[PDB]
Amino acid sequence: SEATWLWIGTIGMVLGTVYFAVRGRGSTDPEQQTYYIITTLIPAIAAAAYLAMATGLGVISDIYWARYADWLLTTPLLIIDLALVAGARKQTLYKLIIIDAIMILGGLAGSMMQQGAVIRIVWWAVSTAAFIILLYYLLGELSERARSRSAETGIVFNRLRNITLGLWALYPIVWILGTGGGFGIIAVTTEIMLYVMLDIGTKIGFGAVLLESQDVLQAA
Ligand SMILES: *C/C=C(C)/C=C/C=C(C)/C=C/C1=C(C)CCCC1(C)C
Numbered sequence: 109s110e111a112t113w114l115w116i117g118t119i120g121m122v123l124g125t126v127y128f129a130v131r132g133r134g135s136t137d138p139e140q141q142t143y144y145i146i147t148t149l150i151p152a153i154a155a156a157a158y159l160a161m162a163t164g165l166g167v168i169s170d171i172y173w174a175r176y177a178d179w180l181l182t183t184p185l186l187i188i189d190l191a192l193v194a195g196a197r198k199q200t201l202y203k204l205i206i207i208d209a210i211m212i213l214g215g216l217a218g219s220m221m222q223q224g225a226v227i228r229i230v231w232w233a234v235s236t237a238a239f240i241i242l243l244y245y246l247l248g249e250l251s252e253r254a255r256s257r258s259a260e261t262g263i264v265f266n267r268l269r270n271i272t273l274g275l276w277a278l279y280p281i282v283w284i285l286g287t288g289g290g291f292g293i294i295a296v297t298t299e300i301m302l303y304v305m306l307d308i309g310t311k312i313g314f315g316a317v318l319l320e321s322q323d324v325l326q327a328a
């Protein structure tokens with residue numbers, strides 16, 4: 109009963125991507141061009157992964173490879189967008205990308221490690237530790253940096269950061285409650301539906317807010 113929700117996610121990502129692409133044309137400043145390329149590439153990768161999952165690919169018997177591939181690809185792009193908005197140094201960005209990659213890779217270790225019970229909980233704990241480190245990172249240095257560019261930049265970055273963090277904090281709960289790498293409290297179809305809603309949020313809503321605020325970010 110999950111094909112319906114996979115196709116819903118597919119169509120939603122497709123609409124988001126087409127909308128972002130139509131918004132992209134006519135861009136002048138190269139920074140806006142970077143914003144448009146990244147913000148359109150994220151939902152396109154998501155749509156490709158969702159179409160793969162919906163058409164008999166994407167899942168291997170016991171494992172879901174398309175979701176984790178999409179995550180490994182797209183989460184660094186969102187981090188890059190946030191850092192560009194805040195103007196963080198390249199070293200901080202490398203740190204953030206490595207920490208996020210470690211988080212997703214730990215999540216994938218739990219989806220594939222299904223021998224006992226404590227081993228997935230340990231993988232979830234360490235990946236959530238990496239998540240908490242990223243949370244600490246986004247609230248501290250990046251916010252002070254964005255405020256150091258200007259106050260409008262600070263407010264815009266705070267809105268983007270609130271959206272990002274609030275939406276990202278729910279993925280590990282879905283993971284720990286689901287059937288894959290979890291305890292089976294919720295079924296597979298509810299897991300996929302909640303992932304679809306979270307992806308709609310984190311990819312289309314964030315991109316809309318970012319691309320709406322480009323005029324005020326330049327004038328500061
Ligand atoms: C566009 C895709 C997004 C925003 C999804 C990101 C995924 C996560 C933040 C998930 C993180 C996890 C943990 C914090 C620990 C348990 C395993 C994961 C991968 C579900």
Ligand SMILES: [Mg+2]
Nearest residue numbers: 154178179307
């Ligand atoms: Mg996603």
Ligand SMILES: [Mg+2]
Nearest residue numbers: 306307310311
């Ligand atoms: Mg998300």
